[PDB]
């Protein structure tokens, strides 16, 4: 893994975005930026050449699964690995996200330890 990979953290709750950014900081990943919704995340990915996306699944403008579908339907962005954040990994939710093309999921509240594990898993 490259500690300098460019990561976009997406969620409507500023406090949560900050917590994720800080946990990533603990793991040595400091090249992190933020978006408050799928609608503001897309243009950042479209013009920013990111390497990884950590998105919450529940957002009011454009939902997490739709951000994922938009990423996968765009020739320029479909390569992007995506980690979804969920309040509970219900089988139905995980199966749908998997069919939509998600790389992995993490259940909140989560720790830096678990985040590290999920990243390794995804980055392969
Ligand atoms: Ca949310």
Numbering used by the authors: 5 to 128
Authors' description from the paper:
We have solved the structures of VcCheY3 in Ca2+ and Mg2+ bound states to the resolutions of 1.67 Å and 2.2 Å respectively. The Ca2+ (or Mg2+) of VcCheY3 is heptacoordinated where four coordinations occur with protein atoms and three with water molecules. The average coordination distance between Ca2+ and the protein atoms is about 2.4 Å while this is of about 2.1 Å in case of Mg2+ which is due to the size difference of the ions. D60 is the site of phosphorylation in VcCheY3 as it corresponds to D57 of StCheY. Both in the Mg2+ and Ca2+ bound free state structures of VcCheY3, the side chain of W61 (that corresponds to W58 of StCheY) is observed in a conformation, substantially different from that of StCheY. In the free state structure of VcCheY3, the side chain of W61 buries unusually deeply with a χ1 of −135° and χ2 of −133°. Y109 stays in its ‘out’ position and the side chain of M88 (with χ1 of 64°, χ2 of 175°) stays between W61 and Y109, packing snugly with W61, Y109 and V106 through hydrophobic interactions. This packing essentially fills up the pocket, required for the ‘inward’ positioning of Y109 upon activation. Moreover, in this inactivated structure of VcCheY3, the crucial T90 of β4α4 loop (that corresponds to T87 of StCheY), which stabilizes the bound phosphate on D60 upon activation, is hydrogen bonded with Q97. To the best of our knowledge, this kind of interaction involving the Thr of β4α4 loop was not observed so far in any other response regulator. In VcCheY3, T90 and Q97 are oriented in such a fashion that together they form a capping on the aforesaid hydrophobic packing and at the same time block the ‘out to in’ trajectory of Y109. Therefore, the hydrophobic packing of W61 with M88 and V106, together with the hydrogen bond between T90 and Q97 and the water mediated interaction between W61 and E100 seem to make a conformational barrier that may affect the process of activation in VcCheY3.
Vibrio cholerae contains multiple copies of chemotaxis response regulator (VcCheY1–VcCheY4) whose functions are elusive yet. Autophosphorylated CheA then donates phosphate to the response regulator CheY. Phosphorylated CheY interacts with the flagellar motor protein FliM and influence the direction of flagellar rotation from counter clock wise (CCW) to clock wise (CW). As expected, both VcCheY3 and VcCheY4 possess (β/α)5 fold typical of the response regulators.
